[PDB]
Amino acid sequence: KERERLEEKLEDANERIAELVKLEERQRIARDLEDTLGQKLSLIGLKSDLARKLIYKDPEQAARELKSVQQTARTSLNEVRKIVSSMKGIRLKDELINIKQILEAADIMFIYEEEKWPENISLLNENILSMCLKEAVTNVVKHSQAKTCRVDIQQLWKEVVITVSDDGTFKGEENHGLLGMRERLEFANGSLHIDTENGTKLTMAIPNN
Amino acid sequence: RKERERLEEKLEDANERIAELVKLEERQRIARDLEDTLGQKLSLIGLKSDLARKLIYKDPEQAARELKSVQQTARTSLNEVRKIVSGIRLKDELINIKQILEAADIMFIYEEEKWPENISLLNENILSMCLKEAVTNVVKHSQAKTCRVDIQQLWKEVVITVSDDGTFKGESKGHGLLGMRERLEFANGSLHIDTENGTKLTMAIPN
Amino acid sequence: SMISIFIAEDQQMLLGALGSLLNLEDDMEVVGKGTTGQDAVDFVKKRQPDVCIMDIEMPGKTGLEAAEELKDTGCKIIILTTFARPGYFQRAIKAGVKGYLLKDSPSEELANAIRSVMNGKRIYAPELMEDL
Ligand SMILES: Nc1ncnc2c1ncn2[C@@H]1O[C@H](COP(=O)(O)OP(=O)(O)CP(=O)(O)O)[C@@H](O)[C@H]1O
Ligand SMILES: Nc1ncnc2c1ncn2[C@@H]1O[C@H](COP(=O)(O)OP(=O)(O)CP(=O)(O)O)[C@@H](O)[C@H]1O
Ligand SMILES: [K+]
Ligand SMILES: [Mg+2]
Ligand SMILES: [Mg+2]
Ligand SMILES: [Mg+2]
């Protein structure tokens, strides 16, 4: 099929656009990481070179220098544990706690029971779902006039499926966050469906193993 | 009429929101590599420093050997971080001149997007040096309130223009203007100056 | 008298440095070294050392998986990690690890955790607690 070589061209085109955004990102990370760890790592080299070169001449000073290397490494590694944690984003377990707080503060009954919790999801897909879950619940709070909100989070077959249901009334037209969620799910080869009959129910799915 | 604009913004936001996901995916990938490389190395350093401190009197020769490994681990780890990319130095000069002009209360007019990415590393470095000097001159001599920097890819040259709204103070061997011209000309580039409405330098180099 | 230790760590440089650091103690002895979870299960079931220093992420079987297989052997397992990852802490407790420490904790604190664990105590790094 010619449709296969054209599918190739859209794949090759998308990747070219993608590599440029990744290149901007590598450039941002590389500059900031150096700005925060660069001198610390160079200080370990110098103080380690200096301590080696004093071992025989001034063992007392070599020891003083090694104490400094010891703590530079320790605190640089503590900064990395921070960097690395931040870079990974909003965990779904943490978002579920945020939505419980938000719904309680809004006097909306939150109904949730852990069933089929995803055993392993990519950090990316987990972060996408967190974003969508937050928005689904922001919409419930801002618009629905619901008294109850039902959240289901389950690994069904090769998907993680999230349903957010409320017993309020849908305020939109026949056809922002709703397109935002759909686009971000669809980017991940997921989906968003909505039912607005008896309140509002959002069914979001994203691939997973 | 302008529903055109309404729709165009609608599309750009869609592109920008997908862009955020592409970032966040790469951001994820780097965190995993730091946790694998950098994290494991900073632990090795800690442990080998600790040991080396304990062996100073007992076995000084081993303590010296551990400190070699520490220094190498440290050097490659700083090198593995610069290796996240592998390049542009004119972007680093951009940062320097923004700081210098802001510190001097001179409004800096530039556009980050228009900067040429493809130029030889040598010619990029020559342009960085000339950009630095053009701005040093603005700060030291012009008494300008505004400084503009343009960077344009025109046919087979990269052209940089540095303009200011101060007043030209000149009427020489070993100094900036001739220095920049000599270095640029050696690279088959050029330097032109206009001192009518303040001072404007046009510097070009092959690309 | 002398505490027998087995060390499981896939990164050879770190494995060697830990052995060196612990052999410096008067009341301790490294009786074996391994690079996988299986190396730990095999040595501990056969040679029965007092303590097993266990890295988590290793090829084949993780240190957490190895810890689960050794739950009812009389061996005291100390986990070492560089990073606090989610559910690592709860899986560590549920496997019955006696210690769960950072790899970069000063050697004086690791030797102290081995003695405390030998005295029937549970030594968990506050940093690794999945609450700050
Ligand atoms: N849970 C819900 N209950 C009732 N109406 C809802 C709803 N979620 C969405 N709507 C309706 O759909 C419209 C569009 O929703 P959407 O989430 O896309 O944007 P928005 O109005 O919340 C602005 P933003 O999400 O950017 O803060 C809302 O204006 C509202 O009328
Ligand atoms: N942007 C500018 N605005 C006003 N006057 C300027 C100017 N750039 C240059 N001039 C004038 O031209 C002279 C020559 O500049 P040039 O860069 O060659 O030497 P300099 O005075 O900056 C010493 P050096 O560059 O070695 O530090 C300056 O001393 C100044 O009087
Ligand atoms: K010993
Ligand atoms: Mg909304
Ligand atoms: Mg000058
Ligand atoms: Mg490991």
Numbering used by the authors:
A (entry chain A): 155 to 329, 335 to 368
B (entry chain B): 154 to 239, 243 to 327, 332 to 367
C (entry chain C): 0 to 131
Give excerpts from the publication.
The simplest TCSs comprise a sensory histidine kinase (HK) and a response regulator (RR) component. We had previously shown that the HK DesK, a member of the HisKA_3 family, undergoes important conformational changes to switch between phosphatase- and phosphotransfer-competent states.
Note best fitting with a one dimer DesKCH188E (chains AB) to one monomer DesR-REC (chain C) model. The structures show the RR REC domain adopting identical conformations in both phosphatase and phosphotransferase complexes, presenting active- and inactive–like features in different regions of the protein, arranging the RR’s active site for phosphoryl group migration. Except for the phosphate lid, the REC domain bound to the HK largely resembles the RR’s active form, shifting the position of the β1α1 loop and helix α1, now able to recruit the Mg2+ cation essential for phosphoryl-transfer catalysis. This loop, acting as a phosphate lid, is open in the phosphotransferase complex, enabling the transfer reaction. Binding to unphosphorylated RR positions the P~His188(HK) into a suitable orientation for phosphoryl-transfer to occur through a loose (dissociative) nucleophilic substitution. The His-Asp distance thus correlates with associative vs dissociative phosphotransfer, but also with the symmetry of the Mg2+ cation with respect to the entering and leaving atoms. The phosphatase/phosphotransferase transition, switches the distance and orientation of the HK histidine side chain with respect to the RR aspartate, enabling for the distinct reaction mechanisms to take place, and ultimately ensuring the unidirectional flow of information.
